[PDB]
Symmetry: none
Subunit: 948 residues, 2 copies
């Protein structure tokens, strides 16, 4: 079905040459041309979701997009695609939505044609084998199992199900093993014949959106892929749409009271509204979302803060199905924010009434049009994975010149649209849902799949009538015009000082200043990552708590000014570390010094409100013991970083230490912390040397002006060490989770500090153990959905870790982990030298890649300056060293460090029990670990790194 149409595309700063076309069998085609990109890519998206499933089997398309991986007629072997993208550094993945399932992958250079050959003919011949089926049912059951107690998916499906039960919206989306194979076989239904029915009828027809990120040309990739795509055959499946919202007045004006697992409190407001997807030029939803969820002077959130009932909120237009859509408002609750909800809804309707009074505005439309004009014009670059899938996601709705100016450019103002959407948002149409823990013994109607409990009580007409008649204005105002808007678009010419790496241009006992100028990207932006260092941060539980609440109330105060800048494209973040305080400004080159001056001057002389401190205190006290509820792989990684640092306060002691946090204690603490400190900063981007010197001087002078900061002495620039293992030990201990009925494990291996050799030894071993572990443990042995192999580097020491979540006894799992190590040990000799080359080159191109976004190279340089390495050219160093490796070297790595007959064995695992609870070699008895401090008592400590 070879038909071709293309022309000039309005593509903004970008250099990627473009064309688009569409094949006569209903296939959208995008041609991307770029001669400077390493990794080429492509990504197919089928415009069919899981709301188009058959009425008997739930999560059938979910299981199909899993099952479309394995097996074609041209290459019927199982992992062939995946192994071919493990050979040439590719990484495919897929996800599922209500109406879309979207395949995507990556490749290096010319290897795209080989990758596409496996990828394209999945559609002709899918196989659906014994083992594929019988293992994917376990992978789907684990996919549902991690989402059982996750409160986001819980409330998602509970909203999905309490609508129209006649609408397909009510039907389940993922499906556990019970609906996938237990439900059909007790009905006699063959799984495979539905898969073939579904692939033939729905999938094969239309509505594909392919893209091709290629580095060849335009014309040659064109006449490659047009020839290569004529085998997809049109079937004329009509566009599946829904002509009505799921709330046909049986389910309107209704409340719900939901009991969560984690102690959270949230309030959910929903409006069903007709579709404005045809109105993507004017897009009233951006105007409504801009005005409602704004955070400025006279905003609604400012009022909710001023009464202290709501911490933060977000609202706006929520996307839904093709036919209908939603409009949400989601706020946080405090104690009497939980008790005085009705007044919160009254204030939302008063702000809506303020919008009902003034109506639409035009200077807002001009302001947002200029902001999206600039912001779309100066876009940096794109990820070769994810960009192509995103554009192919939005290619469905737009003509061939609007594929790029998709929604990031808006032409016209249609205020009649704003009166209509204003007329929908009324108290007749509101749905309310309260999430609170205290609703125990009171909720009878149980969820069918997950098991949460809720109750609907029709709102008493008195509250409804009071909502409609009482719509007036109190103290809510329209948001003042922004001033955080740039006029700085002038590219600064690089100086005679043409260094390619940031140099230490200023050294004191107070600070350290590193500086470059952007030779490549030529954008008017710069980065600033000041990092504060202080002794008193981690001295005790008490002072660490004081640090977290200090920086928390700091951001809570300086948020209300900061919101307009962050909305304008000037972002910041104050955070705390074990070392000190962390500052990161990023954005345009307009008001860099102005915002930075204000932030630093504000956090210099800072004050505390009483009930504000009480709310932040209570809330973080509740957030501490919430750390019981996470997945046990995270819980295990938390215990690993507990044992492998020098000092570490656990969450129990940190929780208990808030028993003494009084407000005068904080107000005494603050200037003692701020008294003396050290600053080390990375400055990167479109500025000059002298302006960088002025910004740094500015900073330290502001500090000396406020709190009279004096420099530190260089003997308390300490870092934390990491615990030595006794050269032969295999250590382990266990915890027990309360909520989840699953066990986790993490299997640590201490090699050595980062010397130039050890990095490339461990990287090559890591890549040769990456893909076969996914092939045999999760896929072939079906150990668990969460499998994570690879290298962990902490405190300047290299390590190897394996993360396995399943529902098993963990010692069986240890035994089969070691069995996988023996299997790899034998497979090492089997690997050919040519296969080794198809691995060391993938390590070179995996390691070597030039940054695309400026934030990437700045984050990399920063990530190396905070580690005191400063070796900015380790990439060239490591790659040049990397070519001088052999295979017998990796046995010399395997034997003494990793094997079981190892004299230098440095092994340690962590068990995490569940709520309730082919061969293995001779593993010795383990030790029990009662006191983690008494563990670390007699053990040596590692050195730190020699600075380059």
């Amino acid at each position: 079905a070879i038909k071709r149409i293309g022309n000039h595309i309005t593509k903004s700063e970008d250099k990627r040459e473009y064309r688009g076309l569409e094949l006569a069998n209903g296939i959208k085609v995008l041609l991307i041309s770029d001669p400077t990109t390493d990794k080429s890519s492509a990504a197919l998206d089928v415009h069919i979701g899981s709301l188009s499933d058959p009425p008997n089997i739930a999560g059938l398309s979910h299981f199909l997009e899993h099952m479309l991986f394995l097996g074609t007629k041209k290459y019927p072997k199982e992992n062939e695609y995946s192994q071919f993208l493990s050979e040439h550094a590719g990484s495919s993945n897929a996800f599922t939505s209500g109406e879309h399932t979207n395949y995507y992958f990556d490749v290096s250079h010319e290897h795209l044609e080989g990758a596409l050959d496996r990828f394209a003919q999945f559609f002709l011949s899918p196989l659906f084998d014994e083992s594929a089926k019988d293992r994917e049912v376990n992978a789907v059951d684990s996919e549902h199992e991690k989402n059982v107690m996750n409160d986001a998916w819980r409330l998602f499906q509970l909203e999905k199900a309490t609508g129209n039960p006649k609408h397909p919206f009510s039907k389940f989306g993922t499906g556990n093993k019970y609906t996938l194979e237990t439900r059909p076989n007790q009905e006699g239904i063959d799984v495979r014949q539905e898969l073939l029915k579904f692939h033939s009828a729905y999938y094969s027809s239309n509505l594909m959106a392919v893209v091709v990120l290629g580095r060849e040309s335009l014309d040659d990739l064109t006449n490659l892929v047009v020839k290569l795509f004529s085998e997809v055959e049109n079937k004329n499946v009509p566009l599946p749409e829904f002509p009505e919202h799921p709330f046909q007045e049986e389910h309107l004006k209704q409340l719900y009271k939901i009991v969560p697992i984690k102690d959270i409190r949230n309030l959910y407001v929903t409006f069903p509204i007709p579709d404005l997807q045809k109105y993507y030029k004017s897009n009233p939803g951006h105007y409504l979302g801009h005005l409602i969820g704004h955070e400025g002077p006279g905003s609604l959130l400012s009022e909710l803060k001023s009464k202290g009932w709501v911490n933060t909120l977000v609202g706006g237009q929520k996307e839904g199905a093709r036919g209908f859509m939603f409009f949400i408002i989601n706020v946080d609750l405090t104690e009497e924010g939980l008790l005085h909800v009705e007044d919160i809804i009254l204030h939302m309707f008063q702000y809506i009434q303020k919008l009902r009074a003034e109506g639409p505005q035009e200077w807002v439309f001009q302001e947002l049009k200029d902001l999206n004009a600039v912001a779309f014009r100066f876009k940096d670059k794109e990820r070769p994975r994810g960009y192509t899938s995103k554009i192919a996601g939005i290619l469905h709705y737009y003509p061939l010149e609007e594929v790029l100016t998709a929604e990031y450019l808006l032409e016209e103002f249609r205020p009649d649209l704003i009166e209509m959407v204003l007329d929908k948002l009324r108290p007749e149409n509101v749905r309310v849902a309260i999430v609170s823990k205290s609703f125990e013994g009171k909720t009878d109607r149980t969820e069918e799949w997950y098991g949460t409990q809720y109750k609907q009580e029709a709102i008493p007409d008195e509250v409804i009538k009071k909502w409609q008649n009482a719509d007036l204005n109190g103290k809510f105002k329209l948001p003042t015009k922004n001033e955080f808007i740039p006029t700085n678009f002038e590219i600064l010419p690089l100086e005679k000082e043409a260094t390619p790496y940031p140099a230490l241009i200023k050294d004191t006992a107070m600070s350290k200043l590193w500086f470059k100028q952007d030779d490549k990207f030529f954008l008017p932006k710069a980065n600033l990552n000041f990092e504060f260092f202080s002794p008193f941060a981690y001295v005790d539980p008490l002072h660490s708590n004081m640090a977290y609440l200090y920086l928390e109330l700091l951001k809570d105060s300086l948020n209300e000014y900061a919101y307009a800048a962050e909305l304008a494209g000037l972002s910041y973040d104050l955070q705390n570390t074990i070392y000190g305080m962390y500052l990161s400004v990023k954005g345009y080159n307009d008001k860099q010094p102005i915002l930075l001056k204000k932030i630093i001057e504000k956090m210099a002389t800072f004050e505390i409100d009483e009930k504000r401190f009480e709310i932040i205190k209570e809330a973080y006290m509740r957030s501490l013991n919430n750390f019981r509820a996470e997945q046990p792989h995270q819980h295990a990684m938390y215990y690993l970083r507990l044992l492998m640092t020098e000092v570490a306060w656990t969450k129990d002691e940190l929780k208990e230490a808030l028993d003494d946090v009084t407000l005068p204690r904080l107000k005494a603490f603050i200037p003692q912390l701020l008294s003396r400190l050290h600053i080390e900063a990375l400055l990167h981007g479109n500025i000059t040397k002298q302006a960088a010197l002025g910004i740094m001087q500015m900073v330290e002078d502001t500090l000396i002006e406020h709190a009279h900061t004096k420099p530190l002495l260089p003997s308390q620039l300490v870092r934390y060490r990491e615990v030595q293992l006794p050269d032969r030990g295999w250590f382990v201990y266990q915890q027990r989770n309360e909520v989840h009925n699953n066990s986790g494990i993490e299997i640590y291996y201490q090699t050595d500090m980062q010397s130039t050799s050890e990095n490339m030894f461990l990287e090559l071993f890591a890549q040769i153990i990456s893909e076969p572990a996914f092939n045999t443990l999760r896929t072939k042995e079906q150990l668990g959905y969460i499998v994570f192999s690879g290298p962990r580097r902490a405190n300047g020491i290299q390590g190897l870790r394996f993360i396995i979540q399943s529902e098993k006894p963990p010692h069986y799992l240890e035994s089969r982990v070691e069995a996988f190590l023996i299997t790899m040990e034998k497979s090492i000799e089997d690997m050919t030298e040519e296969a080794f080359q198809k691995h060391i080159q993938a390590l070179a191109i995996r390691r070597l890649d030039k940054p695309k976004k400026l934030s990437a190279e700045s984050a990399k340089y920063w990530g190396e300056i905070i580690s005191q390495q400063y070796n900015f050219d380790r990439d060239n160093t490591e790659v040049a060293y990397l070519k001088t490796l052999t295979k017998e070297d990796i046995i010399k790595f395997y034997k003494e460090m990793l094997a079981v007959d190892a004299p230098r064995r440095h092994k340690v695992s962590v068990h995490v029990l569940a709520r309730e609870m082919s061969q293995a070699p001779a593993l010795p008895q383990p030790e029990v670990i009662q006191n983690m401090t008494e563990f670390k008592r007699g053990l040596p400590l590692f050195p730190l790194v020699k600075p380059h």
Copy 2:
């Protein structure tokens, strides 16, 4: 001349040594000491003779005779034969010369009574006085006067002796120099010897001898052993030279002195001459005055003098003189501005005297001091075998043989009329003033005769006199309150089922930890308590460390005035700091340590700061800090060694610079932060019970919680500091330049290992095998220096070997010859026989092995084990049981891998100290960056 008069002597029952006093017919006072348990014997001779007896033209003749009288008897006319007999048998002799005594004493190894007595009796028969004794003892006198040139005691005493009546024998010189002995006599041709035989025959032989024998034989053998060889002393009936008049005969009253010193010292000297109260030993008013003047308590004189900030300390009381007269002295400290307010000071002493003249004498005070000194005599502890004999031979002359033990430690009666008499004696007509100050340059013409210091008469004028007498009133001065408490309980407590020989852990909580041991061996009414307060904030940064320092220092300065009167009752304490926390010691009796410890905790909980006190402590520590440029460079080397090989260490430079910011509000904020949350640890040892020990600790920590709401620490923050691991090959060094001393120190450190049970005894035996031959070869033969030391190092649970040598040398020459000494000892290893081996390991054994002798010893050793968190209570016995199972090759193999020059395990590191004129170490922080850290020790 065998005459005997004695009987049973009353001794407080704890003592068991049996005594007998008698006196021989030739005028010899005899006491008999029988202790069959003493290792070393000694002997003593007391002559009641004075420099006043020596002829008016030549001073100190008897001093030069009693020097020259040592060598040569008729039974042993050889020169050194006495001295050689005491050099063989470990003996050591030493005598002094006073205004009314010359008192010979000596000792001997075990049994040499007969021997030494053959070398001791014919001093009375035959003194020789030959050419050589004369010509050597004149050099001995010249060296005694030359070293007593700069001795300030003798200088001020002679200046008090000589500025009275210049005819009175009080103005004589006690020792006598070379001028009177051989400069004026030989130019006048006068024979010293004939005057020496005159003096010896007429004066010494007559009477009033005080022979005494520290023996271990029996009560009689030594008795008729010395009475046999003491009959050649023949009575002469020389009358007792006494003075019936004071030497300050109104010519020198109401007088000042202005003294020019060599050393930068400052002192103020008030002197009162007073009559004889020696017959009145019943009340002893002179020590009563020393009690009431030098008291430091509520309403005391020095209490207000401190409150005015002029005077650190004082001392006063009765000063003995000749038989006839006695003295009464007051010795006070001076500040800078104390030199301007002299008359004010003297007015305050008079004011005090007047307060005592107003409310008068006291009787219950005398009874209290009587009961406390009754207890202090009842429960004596011990006595040194040397020095004791010369003392008790000193008072044998003045007291009957029954009063020789209840000597002054008992007071019969109260004499308020006498106290009125001496209260009438402390008046400004009587005062004698002397002032010490360096600032008296060009102003004092009147030079001292012997030493050559310069002074001034400078009588106090009369307006200053008259203001003292008629204008006399009281301010803030009050007599002291009674502190009887309870002294009635001295009963011993019987041992219970808990018969441990080592302290048992009777309580463990997360707040404290309590170890306990009732006294089995001593059965003495004494108790010891030790306390550690652990807290993280001590050594976090130089500012916090300074705040902790100043806190405990000024805490002591606050509590001293209240506590000192309790310290007079027999309960001593000490507060100091650690790098970890604070150190509290409470030592004394069992009766009232609970009330004292209660008030100590109640006091240091609620604590305040004074301004000028804070300023004085601040300035004082600023001096103590910037002094550290000026100490001995071997100490400099030990300080830098403890800097480099610990985890964190703040040098004195940062502590010096950071003190600019220590203000009062900052400390007053810091104190409750420190005291908020902490850990306790305690050793309890003495005659006590388990329940009262548990109850006192409970009560104590409850009071601690009562004040500042004490909460326990978290058991993950009881960390300790580790020690730096050398890289298995390193020989590291760097240098430090002294500023003041033109001398170069050096310390040669060697890392072996952690304390395993073998390594302690490896290092002790190897240390001892290089101990005595290093003493033989280094200073004598190699002539390295005078301050040379070697041996172990115990720090952070890690052993070590070191060589501290300070000299004025190039430091690398000294390292090279130190390595030559290691090679010399290395080959000196392989030539060792069995005999040297066995005496050496037995030497180590008896060096280590000893039973204890007092509760402070065992309590200090057990505390020394709990502070290191080792807890190995019987390492003594285990290490000794291990020690005999070693060979020569065990220490050869111990030596080679760690210590040799071609060693794989050679852990060597040095510190160079230069005079004012491997790898290098640029930054000590960048040094400690990349070296690993050792583990700690598992507690048993």
